């Protein structure tokens, strides 16, 4: 018992060229039936399956981003020089010292030390509580790959198409030419927590002249610590008959603190299925912010005679149902697809009713029995859902009671207004 739920029939009078713009986290399923222009009853299946985008980024390990606390201390001496004694800030992890050597007058002098031009006033800015807050990587190069499978008549061919490669067969050619990317080289990816949580994108990550407060000021490189300088100047505040204290009118908040303050002003990104090594970082972008340009061309010299002997026979039967026919609940259909006269055959099964088809599922069937699950949403009260191939469907169906990041394009003519609100 078959029903008119076939695929788009395309006569091969001329070559079949196609251009695609695949989103980042999207898998395409384009299938038609190429018709011999010399015989209306000679048709061969053509299936095109393209996977998601795999982003391969050769990166440079920048290290760990450290967060510290600002501290300032002052050290006064009556006689000697500033380069004679030691100070507790000189032994810290990061420290910057500005000393007023031989600048002991009398207005800044304490009640002790009745001398002029003989003292020393050293000021030390150091950072404590250094703790790692995230990991930083720098993009060196980018590479985008997609896995494509074709099914023409009885032939099946698969390949991982790169930017400098194409899946070329005797009749079909699939090329990957362009890629619009959110990421580009010389960018800095910062992961605050683990990888799966995503991260942020920084462009002006300081490398040579880092200051306290800039993104990347304090870094825990594998060679050692890399401390920045300060954004400000020193001054000596003093009163009469008091020890001269040291002031610093500059930036006090660290780079991580300012980043948390204005985190909304930076670019965010997510990752899925991450794989990081000592040289690369592979992941799939789920935000669908990248587009790949794919060119497919099928010549009209298909030789319909060679692709017609012993085609792939497919039988199916609906065996189980679970869910509801309401628009929003969804139902799950189980099909027992039996493939014969072919070792492997790439096609797709649809869950159809008397009128429409509310779901599809692409699967590479093996010679024998195959269990296929199909998800669907919609239907009416008396909708008897069945499993369906191109034209042939199951003998019986089942009835129910009371997105997925896949794209299906089979060229089937959808039902008009007669199937709306019935």
């Amino acid at each position, epitope marked *: 018992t078959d029903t008119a739920h076939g695929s788009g029939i395309i006569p091969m009078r001329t070559d079949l060229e196609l251009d695609f713009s695949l989103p980042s986290s999207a898998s395409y399923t384009y299938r038609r039936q190429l018709q011999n222009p010399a015989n209306e009853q000679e048709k061969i299946p053509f299936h095109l399956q393209i996977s998601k985008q795999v982003i*391969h980024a*050769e990166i440079q390990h920048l290290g760990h981003w450290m967060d510290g606390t600002f501290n300032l201390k002052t050290a006064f001496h009556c006689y000697g020089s500033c380069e004679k004694y030691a100070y507790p800030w000189q032994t810290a992890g990061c420290f910057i010292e500005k000393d007023y050597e031989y600048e002991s007058g009398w207005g800044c002098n304490p009640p002790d030390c009745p001398g002029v031009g003989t003292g020393c006033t050293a000021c030390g800015v150091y950072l404590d509580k250094l703790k790692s807050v995230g990991k930083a990587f*720098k*993009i*060196v*190069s*980018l*590479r985008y790959t997609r896995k494509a499978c074709i099914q023409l008549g009885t032939e099946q061919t698969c390949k991982s198409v790169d*930017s*400098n490669d194409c899946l070329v067969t005797t009749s079909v050619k699939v090329c990957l030419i362009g890629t619009v990317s959110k990421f*580009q*080289p*010389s960018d800095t990816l910062l992961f605050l927590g683990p990888l799966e949580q995503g991260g942020l994108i920084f462009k002006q990550w300081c*490398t*040579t*002249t880092c200051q306290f407060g800039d993104p990347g000021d304090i870094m825990s490189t594998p060679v050692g610590m890399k401390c920045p300088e300060l954004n400000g100047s020193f001054r000596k505040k003093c009163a009469f008959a008091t020890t001269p204290v040291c002031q610093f009118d500059g930036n006090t908040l660290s780079g991580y603190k300012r980043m948390i303050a204005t985190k909304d002003s930076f670019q965010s990104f997510n990752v899925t299925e991450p794989h990081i*090594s*000592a*040289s*690369s970082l592979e992941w799939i972008d789920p935000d669908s912010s990248l587009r790949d340009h794919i060119n497919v061309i099928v010549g009209r010299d298909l030789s319909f005679q060679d692709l017609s002997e012993t085609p792939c026979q497919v039988d199916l039967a609906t065996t189980s149902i679970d869910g509801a026919w309401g628009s929003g609940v969804g139902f799950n259909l189980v099909c027992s697809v039996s493939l014969t006269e072919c070792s492997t055959f790439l096609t797709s099964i649809k869950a159809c009713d008397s009128a429409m088809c509310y779901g599809s599922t692409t699967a590479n069937l093996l010679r024998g029995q195959n269990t296929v699950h199909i998800v669907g949403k919609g239907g009416h009260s008396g909708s008897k859902f069945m499993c369906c191939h191109d034209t042939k469907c199951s003998s019986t169906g089942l009835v129910a009671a009371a997105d997925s990041d896949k794209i299906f394009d089979d060229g089937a003519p959808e039902c008009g207004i007669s199937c709306w609100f019935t």
Partner: antibody
Amino acid sequence: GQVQMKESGGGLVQPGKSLKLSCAASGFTFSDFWMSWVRQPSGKGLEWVARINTNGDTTHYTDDMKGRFTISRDNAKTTLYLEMSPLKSEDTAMYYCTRDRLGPFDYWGQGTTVTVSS
Amino acid sequence: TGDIVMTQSPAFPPVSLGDTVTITCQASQSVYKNLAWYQQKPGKSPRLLIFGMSSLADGVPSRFSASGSDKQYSLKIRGLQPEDAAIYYCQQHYIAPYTFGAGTRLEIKR
């Protein structure tokens, strides 16, 4: 710690004989980077020759040496190889083994001289 | 061949020591950010200077910098020294084949 790469296996060969070049790398994970060979004639510009991936199933060559050059690697000893078919007089140059980062080359070796003369 | 050509202008006039110099590298096609600069000292092996058109390589002094507009890039050196007087190359790696440049040699004026 430090990255160090040394070439070897070069010298003088007859115009029409084979020659295999070796390159030992150390100081980094050899089984995580793409490797590549780049030669340069006497006082001329650089010329990319070949490129190999991590395992060795994907090898890129130039349209000139159609099957003449064969790049291989051994991750157990961290070594790079470049087998060459019967050469010609236009292959006399100095070959460097580089650490290909899918594009730019971030580390170059000392380089060995290959002379093809009679 | 339909490959991209990286025009690197040789024969640069000598410049005094301690000043600022700038070398250009023109492209036959826009590669947008996939540009690397190299340095080859006389007799020694090449050395990666700058990757990603703006990122300094490890072990390169802070007096090096690079930028550029569409298909027109530059490499700036501030505070010249007698050491970094060699030949510089530019390589694009946007689309295959990844081609190199011609080469520009500096000359310190003493």
